[PDB]
Amino acid sequence: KKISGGSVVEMQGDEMTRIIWELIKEKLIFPYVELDLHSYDLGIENRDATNDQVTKDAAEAIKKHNVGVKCATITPDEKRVEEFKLKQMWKSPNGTIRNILGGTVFREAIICKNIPRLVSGWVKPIIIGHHAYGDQYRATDFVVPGPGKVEITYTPSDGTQKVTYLVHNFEEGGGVAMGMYNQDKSIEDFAHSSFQMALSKGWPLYLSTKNTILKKYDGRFKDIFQEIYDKQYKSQFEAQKIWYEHRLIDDMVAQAMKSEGGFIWACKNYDGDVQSDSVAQGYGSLGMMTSVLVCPDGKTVEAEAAHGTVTRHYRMYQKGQETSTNPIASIFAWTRGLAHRAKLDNNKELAFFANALEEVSIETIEAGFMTKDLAACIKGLPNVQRSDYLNTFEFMDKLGENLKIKLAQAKLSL
Amino acid sequence: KKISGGSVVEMQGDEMTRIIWELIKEKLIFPYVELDLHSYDLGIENRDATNDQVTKDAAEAIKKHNVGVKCATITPDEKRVEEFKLKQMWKSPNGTIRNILGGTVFREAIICKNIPRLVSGWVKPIIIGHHAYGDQYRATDFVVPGPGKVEITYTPSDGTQKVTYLVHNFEEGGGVAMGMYNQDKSIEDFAHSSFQMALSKGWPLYLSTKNTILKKYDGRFKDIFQEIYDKQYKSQFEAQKIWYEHRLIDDMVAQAMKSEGGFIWACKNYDGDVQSDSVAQGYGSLGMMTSVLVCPDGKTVEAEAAHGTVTRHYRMYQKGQETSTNPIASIFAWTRGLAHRAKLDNNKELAFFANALEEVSIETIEAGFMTKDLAACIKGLPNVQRSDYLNTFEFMDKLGENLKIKLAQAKL
Ligand SMILES: NC(=O)c1ccc[n+]([C@@H]2O[C@H](COP(=O)([O-])OP(=O)(O)OC[C@H]3O[C@@H](n4cnc5c(N)ncnc54)[C@H](OP(=O)(O)O)[C@@H]3O)[C@@H](O)[C@H]2O)c1
Ligand SMILES: NC(=O)c1ccc[n+]([C@@H]2O[C@H](COP(=O)([O-])OP(=O)(O)OC[C@H]3O[C@@H](n4cnc5c(N)ncnc54)[C@H](OP(=O)(O)O)[C@@H]3O)[C@@H](O)[C@H]2O)c1
Ligand SMILES: O=C(O)CCC(=O)C(=O)O
Ligand SMILES: O=C(O)CCC(=O)C(=O)O
Ligand SMILES: [Ca+2]
Ligand SMILES: [Ca+2]
């Protein structure tokens, strides 16, 4: 440890990403960077032991220190309750954190020149901002056990009126029902971040909704974006020869699929969650994408890997079999977090380190050293041989070597 | 107008699809087929005129006659209300029809061997069955004007305690809120249709949900599928060497993107709606896809194009400008409906005709006569010249001749 990093909130995860997380710290961060590290273990076991209170604490710590880096976590269902002998099916730690912090989640592929895409046309990046607050992650769902009436009601805080809407009358048998909601202020912040991101990149902005189907719910997003565009941002867009356009999600996914890339895609929370996986895989790997939650203040960020804990690879790890799991997304959670840390503190040595590690990661892959997913992009999956890639440790070690070299050359330079 | 078709419900649409619809009847269907045809105009003007009653009437007619073919329709938002001077913002006719009929919507790309895909890997078809009932199409959404409590309650029919849950307490400002629901029986029918489709195609089946997030709501879909699989179709799958698996939707879309295709994808209503467009475009055009609603009765069917009315091309049509818009999906709405009609009536002539029109459509494109979208698939869009594609009228004409030849050559 030499560079003085400052205050960072670290959230430990589960399964294969927890393995990779420790390797990143040991071989990449800790040798070169001293951090005041506020560490919260979001491993499923510690969440169960704390009644998921560690998750709320971690989110409050991020508010305090303005940067956090999160490892992927298990969101348990019934099967996970049985697997770990959990007390309850805990809520997604990502939902909990994003709903405490608010803001927009920006996701973008990590491009290496030698890696063929699955989608032939994307020669420019697609950047998905997605609203981080509300909707399905805050929803209230339940089983309808039998016949009866489901209603949803709104009571203003003065208690002077009540509006009851019929959801469904279940005449025969049961089913499921759910309420969900969003807030105007959170929607307004989301539009601002989306418009500002478009201007920062010089790219057109598209917002996707279902507003033809949900006329009030999605119509509110469409209206808030349009009001804020026509008032504040529309001339700035024209000055850069870019535009803002609302599209139906149906049209939007087809346009993106056939596009060349090079646009900002504003998504509702659920669409951004799902489409970012399609996009990341389309550029060739879920392991090559960045995800940063940018809070409305412009000060606080949470960087993360958007993919999951890679359970299938973890099961092989548990048997001693070789794994090749792409660490790049998890590494970029650290570099994006430290880069923001550096900016807040005007720390040039940290800013240099964060970019250096990003450069090493891409250069290493472009020199032919990669995990199996990326070799599968170059070859076909059925054509890949063991000699074509590196196991998770071998790849981390190669990154470690090249990082030491790159930082050694920087010190020698000038 | 020789072959006797039987009874078919026709639903007329809007904008560019409406133009193509009448061309298909004139140049393709009516010369070779006589039908007992119950026509319902779902064009946005007639729906307004009838206060949407025509949409429910058409759905009731499909229940009666077991087959319908639907042109794409406008679902109005505020901008459409002003455009057409509408009385109300009408609900989607597709939502209305699907929730009356129930069942599963099956969507599959129409493959021409000369058309390159956007997605490198898919050499086998992807069939999305999607639940036709409930969820977002049946939702109750509203604006929250200001601070206050939104709650959701369940009052059982047995007189027992009413159950109340807090949705959100808005502490400052307003927002939006929505209820939505689904029914056990509809989910069970959706499960059975999915398992049977996989066995009939010999392909593995995947169900995608968000059940880690919606634990009760999406958990019910996952539990019902798993229960019906274990007790009913499991041994049949193993005999055919296929399998059923639930995946989270995040994993599923990425798995699908990198696959070679060749599976049935069971989706919830909203996911199937959206993913079907991404899959159709990935095989290279929104114009090449079949969409067939299969009702739980095993009898009734509604065939449609899954895409919209193509407003942008319609606006150019309104200016007298040349357009190239892909009719194939609107045509396959006709062929799929007639094919089902022919199966119900055991009409071997109608069945032959329906297949022939499909073969003609594919063979025409495979010969190099295609609309602009398909030309763009081959050459890339910036490289497409005018000599590479036929305009919408030209393309319909070329299909009409190849059809006339294919049936005359079959007269032998
Ligand atoms: N950000 C988050 O905290 C987050 C997000 C999503 C899911 N999860 C959680 O993760 C757990 C597992 O979910 P899941 O199995 O649906 O999905 P997953 O962990 O994302 O992995 C599913 C598949 O995606 C591929 N993959 C994902 N990340 C990869 C990487 N870094 N390198 C190489 N391949 C990668 C692998 O494909 P192959 O099998 O073909 O090799 C893997 O088997 C669940 O408990 C879920 O709740 C967490
Ligand atoms: N089944 C239905 O009744 C249905 C389904 C969806 C939407 N709609 C309705 O249709 C209206 C417009 O929707 P939208 O503009 O979002 O999408 P759309 O009408 O489906 O088409 C939008 C874009 O998709 C491409 N496209 C769709 N069909 C095509 C075809 N047959 N041939 C060539 N290209 C095709 C065109 O791309 P390019 O612009 O690049 O040429 C078009 O501009 C709305 O009122 C909506 O409610 C109806
Ligand atoms: O939190 C979860 O359960 C999944 C999160 C996810 O898929 C995402 O953030 O893209
Ligand atoms: O009914 C609508 O408004 C849209 C329908 C749609 O996009 C679909 O059926 O896939
Ligand atoms: Ca996701
Ligand atoms: Ca659709």
| Closest ligand 1 atom to A313 CA | 43
C-alpha pair distances (Å), B365 with each of A129, B40, B111: 39, 31, 10
Write the CB contacts of A22 (distance below 8 Å, at least 6 apart in sequence): none
A152 touches chain B (CB under 8 A): yes
Write the CB contacts of A245 (distance below 8 Å, at least 6 apart in sequence): A204, A205, A206, A207
User: How far apart are alpha carbons A332 and A407 in whole angstroms?
Assistant: 17
Q: A153's torsion region: left (phi>0), alpha (psi -120 to 50) or beta?
A: beta
Contact between residue B334 and residue B303 where contact means Cβ atoms under 8 Å apart:
yes
Which residues of chain B does A291 touch, with a Cβ-Cβ cutoff of 8 Å? none
Contact between residue B362 and residue B110 where contact means Cβ atoms under 8 Å apart:
yes
A319 burial level (CB within 10 Å; 0-12, 13-18, 19+): exposed
Domain layout of chain A by residue ranges: 1-414
User: At B169, phi and psi to the nearest 5?
Assistant: -105, 115
Nearest to A152 by CA among B153, B181, B166, B170: B153
User: How far apart are alpha carbons B26 and A381 in whole angstroms?
Assistant: 49
Q: What is the DSSP string of A18-29?
A: HHHHHHHIIIII
User: At A330, phi and psi to the nearest 5?
Assistant: -65, -40
Put simply, the answer to whether A154 touches B142 (Cβ < 8 Å) is: yes
CA dihedral over A268, A274, A280, A284, signed as positive or negative: negative
Contact between residue B181 and residue B240 where contact means Cβ atoms under 8 Å apart:
no
Counted across chains A and B, CB pairs separated by less than 8 A come out at: 282
**Is the beta carbon of A306 within 6 A of some atom in ligand 1?**
yes
- DSSP, res A233: I
A368 touches chain B (CB under 8 A): no
Q: Which two tokens stand for residue A330?
A: 């998890």
The owner of tokens 């049949």 is B236
Put simply, the answer to whether A181 touches B182 (Cβ < 8 Å) is: no
User: How far apart are alpha carbons A14 and A21 in whole angstroms?
Assistant: 9
User: How far apart are alpha carbons B124 and A132 in whole angstroms?
Assistant: 36
Residues with CB under 5 A from ligand 6 (ion): A 250; B 273, 277
Q: Whats the size of chain B, residue-wise?
A: 412
User: What residue in B sits closest to A273 (Cα-Cα)?
Assistant: B250
Q: Report the Cα B411 to chain-centroid distance in Å.
A: 34
Q: Which two tokens stand for residue A357?
A: 């590690």
| Closest ligand 1 atom to B254 CA | 24
Run of H or E residues at A69: strand A67-70
Q: Report the Cα B155 to chain-centroid distance in Å.
A: 35
User: How far apart are alpha carbons B77 and A216 in whole angstroms?
Assistant: 10
Which residues of chain B does A154 touch, with a Cβ-Cβ cutoff of 8 Å? 142, 144, 148-150, 177
Nearest to B124 by CA among B50, B193, B204: B204
Put simply, the answer to whether B281 touches A258 (Cβ < 8 Å) is: yes
Which residues of chain B does A156 touch, with a Cβ-Cβ cutoff of 8 Å? 145-148
Write the CB contacts of B340 (distance below 8 Å, at least 6 apart in sequence): B66, B67, B292, B301, B303
B241 burial level (CB within 10 Å; 0-12, 13-18, 19+): exposed
Put simply, the answer to whether B212 touches A274 (Cβ < 8 Å) is: no
CA dihedral over B209, B211, B215, B221, signed as positive or negative: positive
Contact between residue A65 and residue A4 where contact means Cβ atoms under 8 Å apart:
no
Which residues does residue A175 pair with via DSSP β-bridges, in sequence order?
A: A144, B183
Which residues does residue B209 pair with via DSSP β-bridges, in sequence order?
A: B248
Pairing of strands A301-304, A67-70: parallel
**Strand, helix or coil at B143?**
strand
User: What residue in B sits closest to A272 (Cα-Cα)?
Assistant: B250
User: How far apart are alpha carbons A172 and A146 in whole angstroms?
Assistant: 7
Which 55-94 residues of chain B touch chain A by CB within 8 A?
75-78, 89, 92
Q: How was this structure determined?
A: X-ray
User: How far apart are alpha carbons B202 and B220 in whole angstroms?
Assistant: 26
Contact between residue A401 and residue A361 where contact means Cβ atoms under 8 Å apart:
no
A27 burial level (CB within 10 Å; 0-12, 13-18, 19+): middle
Write the CB contacts of A187 (distance below 8 Å, at least 6 apart in sequence): A131, A220, A221, A224, B175
Write the CB contacts of A115 (distance below 8 Å, at least 6 apart in sequence): A283, A284, A285, A288, A365, A370, A374, A377, A378
CATH top-level class for A1-414?
Answer: alpha beta
User: How far apart are alpha carbons A215 and B143 in whole angstroms?
Assistant: 10
**Is the beta carbon of A307 within 6 A of some atom in ligand 1?**
yes
Which residue's C-alpha comes closest to atom 5 of ligand 3? Answer: A94
Which residue's C-alpha comes closest to atom 48 of ligand 2? Answer: B308
User: How far apart are alpha carbons A401 and A408 in whole angstroms?
Assistant: 11
A149 touches chain B (CB under 8 A): yes
Which residues of chain B does A267 touch, with a Cβ-Cβ cutoff of 8 Å? none
**Is the beta carbon of A306 within 6 A of some atom in ligand 3?**
yes
User: At B6, phi and psi to the nearest 5?
Assistant: 95, -160
Other beta carbons within 10 Å of A309: 22
Residue to test with chain A: of B94, B152, B273, B373, most A Cβ within 10 A? B152
Measure A94 CA to ligand 3 centroid, in angstroms. 7
Measure B25 CA to ligand 4 centroid, in angstroms. 23
- Name the strands in the sheet holding B244-248, side by side, starting at the edge strand that comes first in the sequence: B33-41, B3-12, B67-70, B301-304, B289-294, B104-109, B126-131, B263-267, B205-209, B244-248
A148 touches chain B (CB under 8 A): yes
Lining ligand 2 with CB less than 6 A are A 212, 248, 250-251, 254; B 72-75, 94, 286-287, 304, 306-312, 325-326, 373
Put simply, the answer to whether A183 touches B175 (Cβ < 8 Å) is: yes
Run of H or E residues at B68: strand B67-70
Q: Which two tokens stand for residue B341?
A: 């009609």
B202 burial level (CB within 10 Å; 0-12, 13-18, 19+): exposed
CATH top-level class for B1-412?
Answer: alpha beta
The owner of tokens 């969650």 is A273
**Is the beta carbon of B212 within 6 A of some atom in ligand 3?**
yes
Contact between residue A244 and residue A225 where contact means Cβ atoms under 8 Å apart:
yes
Put simply, the answer to whether B179 touches A150 (Cβ < 8 Å) is: yes
